[PDB]
Design a protein around this motif. Sequence first.
Motif, PDB file in Angstrom:
ATOM      1  N   UNK A  73     -14.932  -6.089 -65.218  1.00  0.00           N
ATOM      2  CA  UNK A  73     -15.390  -6.390 -66.566  1.00  0.00           C
ATOM      3  C   UNK A  73     -14.529  -5.857 -67.689  1.00  0.00           C
ATOM      4  N   UNK A  74     -14.382  -6.702 -68.698  1.00  0.00           N
ATOM      5  CA  UNK A  74     -13.620  -6.412 -69.890  1.00  0.00           C
ATOM      6  C   UNK A  74     -14.501  -6.686 -71.095  1.00  0.00           C
ATOM      7  N   UNK A  75     -14.124  -6.192 -72.271  1.00  0.00           N
ATOM      8  CA  UNK A  75     -14.762  -6.400 -73.557  1.00  0.00           C
ATOM      9  C   UNK A  75     -14.800  -7.863 -73.912  1.00  0.00           C
ATOM     10  N   UNK A  76     -15.812  -8.243 -74.673  1.00  0.00           N
ATOM     11  CA  UNK A  76     -15.928  -9.609 -75.147  1.00  0.00           C
ATOM     12  C   UNK A  76     -14.776  -9.923 -76.080  1.00  0.00           C
ATOM     13  N   UNK A  77     -14.375  -8.926 -76.843  1.00  0.00           N
ATOM     14  CA  UNK A  77     -13.258  -9.003 -77.754  1.00  0.00           C
ATOM     15  C   UNK A  77     -12.378  -7.814 -77.537  1.00  0.00           C
ATOM     16  N   UNK A  78     -11.110  -8.054 -77.316  1.00  0.00           N
ATOM     17  CA  UNK A  78     -10.226  -6.940 -77.074  1.00  0.00           C
ATOM     18  C   UNK A  78      -9.383  -6.605 -78.273  1.00  0.00           C
ATOM     19  N   UNK A  79      -9.364  -7.491 -79.252  1.00  0.00           N
ATOM     20  CA  UNK A  79      -8.475  -7.292 -80.366  1.00  0.00           C
ATOM     21  C   UNK A  79      -8.691  -8.223 -81.527  1.00  0.00           C
ATOM     22  N   UNK A  80      -9.050  -7.677 -82.664  1.00  0.00           N
ATOM     23  CA  UNK A  80      -9.143  -8.512 -83.840  1.00  0.00           C
ATOM     24  C   UNK A  80      -7.819  -8.428 -84.556  1.00  0.00           C
ATOM     25  N   UNK A  81      -7.206  -9.563 -84.822  1.00  0.00           N
ATOM     26  CA  UNK A  81      -5.884  -9.542 -85.421  1.00  0.00           C
ATOM     27  C   UNK A  81      -5.888 -10.020 -86.833  1.00  0.00           C
ATOM     28  N   UNK A  82      -5.580  -9.148 -87.770  1.00  0.00           N
ATOM     29  CA  UNK A  82      -5.514  -9.579 -89.151  1.00  0.00           C
ATOM     30  C   UNK A  82      -4.104 -10.033 -89.464  1.00  0.00           C
ATOM     31  N   UNK A  83      -3.960 -11.240 -90.000  1.00  0.00           N
ATOM     32  CA  UNK A  83      -2.634 -11.802 -90.235  1.00  0.00           C
ATOM     33  C   UNK A  83      -1.740 -11.043 -91.231  1.00  0.00           C
ATOM     34  N   UNK A  84      -2.095 -10.877 -92.506  1.00  0.00           N
ATOM     35  CA  UNK A  84      -1.291 -10.233 -93.529  1.00  0.00           C
ATOM     36  C   UNK A  84      -1.336  -8.722 -93.440  1.00  0.00           C
ATOM     37  N   UNK A  85      -0.854  -8.179 -92.324  1.00  0.00           N
ATOM     38  CA  UNK A  85      -0.783  -6.739 -92.073  1.00  0.00           C
ATOM     39  C   UNK A  85      -0.344  -5.924 -93.268  1.00  0.00           C
ATOM     40  N   UNK A  86       0.635  -6.441 -93.984  1.00  0.00           N
ATOM     41  CA  UNK A  86       1.174  -5.781 -95.141  1.00  0.00           C
ATOM     42  C   UNK A  86       1.102  -6.700 -96.336  1.00  0.00           C
ATOM     43  N   UNK A  87       0.385  -6.302 -97.368  1.00  0.00           N
ATOM     44  CA  UNK A  87       0.287  -7.136 -98.553  1.00  0.00           C
ATOM     45  C   UNK A  87       0.472  -6.298 -99.793  1.00  0.00           C
ATOM     46  N   UNK A  88       0.675  -6.947-100.921  1.00  0.00           N
ATOM     47  CA  UNK A  88       0.929  -6.231-102.150  1.00  0.00           C
ATOM     48  C   UNK A  88       0.386  -7.016-103.314  1.00  0.00           C
ATOM     49  N   UNK A  89      -0.923  -6.974-103.452  1.00  0.00           N
ATOM     50  CA  UNK A  89      -1.620  -7.738-104.456  1.00  0.00           C
ATOM     51  C   UNK A  89      -1.680  -7.027-105.774  1.00  0.00           C
ATOM     52  N   UNK A  90      -1.186  -7.681-106.814  1.00  0.00           N
ATOM     53  CA  UNK A  90      -1.179  -7.093-108.141  1.00  0.00           C
ATOM     54  C   UNK A  90      -2.586  -6.949-108.663  1.00  0.00           C
ATOM     55  N   UNK A  91      -2.818  -5.855-109.375  1.00  0.00           N
ATOM     56  CA  UNK A  91      -4.113  -5.509-109.948  1.00  0.00           C
ATOM     57  C   UNK A  91      -4.830  -6.706-110.531  1.00  0.00           C
ATOM     58  N   UNK A  92      -6.034  -6.967-110.043  1.00  0.00           N
ATOM     59  CA  UNK A  92      -6.819  -8.084-110.539  1.00  0.00           C
ATOM     60  C   UNK A  92      -6.591  -9.399-109.777  1.00  0.00           C
ATOM     61  N   UNK A  93      -5.649  -9.423-108.833  1.00  0.00           N
ATOM     62  CA  UNK A  93      -5.325 -10.653-108.105  1.00  0.00           C
ATOM     63  C   UNK A  93      -6.125 -10.853-106.821  1.00  0.00           C
ATOM     64  N   UNK A  94      -5.665 -11.789-105.985  1.00  0.00           N
ATOM     65  CA  UNK A  94      -6.358 -12.099-104.739  1.00  0.00           C
ATOM     66  C   UNK A  94      -5.441 -12.364-103.555  1.00  0.00           C
ATOM     67  N   UNK A  95      -5.969 -12.126-102.358  1.00  0.00           N
ATOM     68  CA  UNK A  95      -5.234 -12.344-101.113  1.00  0.00           C
ATOM     69  C   UNK A  95      -6.095 -12.859 -99.998  1.00  0.00           C
ATOM     70  N   UNK A  96      -5.691 -13.954 -99.399  1.00  0.00           N
ATOM     71  CA  UNK A  96      -6.444 -14.485 -98.288  1.00  0.00           C
ATOM     72  C   UNK A  96      -6.044 -13.849 -96.968  1.00  0.00           C
ATOM     73  N   UNK A  97      -7.037 -13.368 -96.234  1.00  0.00           N
ATOM     74  CA  UNK A  97      -6.848 -12.763 -94.929  1.00  0.00           C
ATOM     75  C   UNK A  97      -7.332 -13.663 -93.806  1.00  0.00           C
ATOM     76  N   UNK A  98      -6.743 -13.497 -92.632  1.00  0.00           N
ATOM     77  CA  UNK A  98      -7.119 -14.284 -91.466  1.00  0.00           C
ATOM     78  C   UNK A  98      -7.297 -13.425 -90.250  1.00  0.00           C
TER      79      UNK A  98
END
Lengths: 445, 42
Positions: A342-367
């Motif tokens: 037996x193994x975990x149902x989920x072994x790893x959640x992977x967030x795409x934009x590991x490194x981001x640099x959003x300017x104050x007040x802005x937005x960033x889409x994550x996956x």
Amino acid sequence: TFNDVKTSLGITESYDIVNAIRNSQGDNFKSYVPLATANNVAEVGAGILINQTVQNDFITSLVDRIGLVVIRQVSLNNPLKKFKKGQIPLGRTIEEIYTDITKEKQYDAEEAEQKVFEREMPNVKTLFHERNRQGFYHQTIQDDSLKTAFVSWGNFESFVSSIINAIYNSAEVDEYEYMKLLVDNYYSKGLFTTVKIDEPTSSTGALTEFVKKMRATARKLTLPQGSRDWNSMAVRTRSYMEDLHLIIDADLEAELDVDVLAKAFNMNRTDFLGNVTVIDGFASTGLEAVLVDKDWFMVYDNLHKMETVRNPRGLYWNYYYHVWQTLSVSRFANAVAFVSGDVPAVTQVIVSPNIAAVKQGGQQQFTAYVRATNAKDHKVVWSVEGGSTGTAITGDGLLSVSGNEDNQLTVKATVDIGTEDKPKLVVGEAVVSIRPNNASGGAQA
Amino acid sequence: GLLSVSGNEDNQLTVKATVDIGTEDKPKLVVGEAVVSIRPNN
């Protein structure tokens, strides 16, 4: 100076043999009864751990001598040496760069009039590697002490040589072991894509299903269009059959040969499609076959240098074999682990934009690429830590940064495998620098 | 002849078909046989 050492030192005797022979009638030891010195052979033949003084039979006072010194020489290698990528003479750190594919946008001339110069950054991901190993093999040799053991220079010299060779053996054995460490490590982190299989070292039905999964998986890895599901970084990667390596172990090797290939008329229909590189096995519980790209290993050498010094007081040489090297694994390379229990149902959640640099007040889409091990859906929860009052993230991954943010942020992707009593908060994570904008202030905005 | 294995089957199975030739207290069975191996499926 050990005195009363028994010849039975450490012998977990299963029955004897002398008694067996002398009491044998039609007991199969009858063939040894005609032997004149069987008892003596039985006494010594097994080998003697500790030399005891033996006197000459003709003249009690004389001592029987050593008429032959056999110095064994072993040479060990590194099964996985072929995965070494070379040397990094200078420069410590290695940077991998990989460009992920773009998305399809629907043609829309109307909208386009306000989007000509939109400016959209590429899905580029990088990964760093770094010199990790730095140790040495310390071996001291008290020359003149050894000279009292030996009575011949051929023996003496070759003995010393053997010691030095042992140093090199030590090094390659450990190198091998470190490569194994990297596999168990990668696994312990949960970076492998997990393919669950019934134990193949049991019923041949399990073996069979396993083989199918291996051939199928290999093919999936090599599909022309590529895939994200075999890549820890979750990027569209295509492999090549000749670049795949299958590690497994000697057990499975034998199981396949005897139970399947010996009967197969078309062995190429059941063999393994990649390059099989048998090892002794892995430490991780249930970790069996490992199928990876040849560039999965990021092993580079930084130093191989033998240093020596002679202690003039305490007569002896020291040998310091220094070994520095980069020991790491590419997450862009494809990597699949086949696991038994037996193994975990989920072994790893992977967030795409590991490194981001959003300017104050802005937005960033994550996956998030929740590495589920089954067909069940696994809702992910987005959250932000270290953020100010107005910083928050939409349940669809859209991050909104406060208009007064300044602290470096982190974004999490949580998936609860377990339950209410004991939740299993599997978390993917990414970080965001603010590098804040300006020209604002005030109230109401 | 529909063989059904619900699961949890780790033993090789033997499938046979018989025909009773003869009479009462004289079951001279003629028999056919198929070899069934099992492939694990959780």
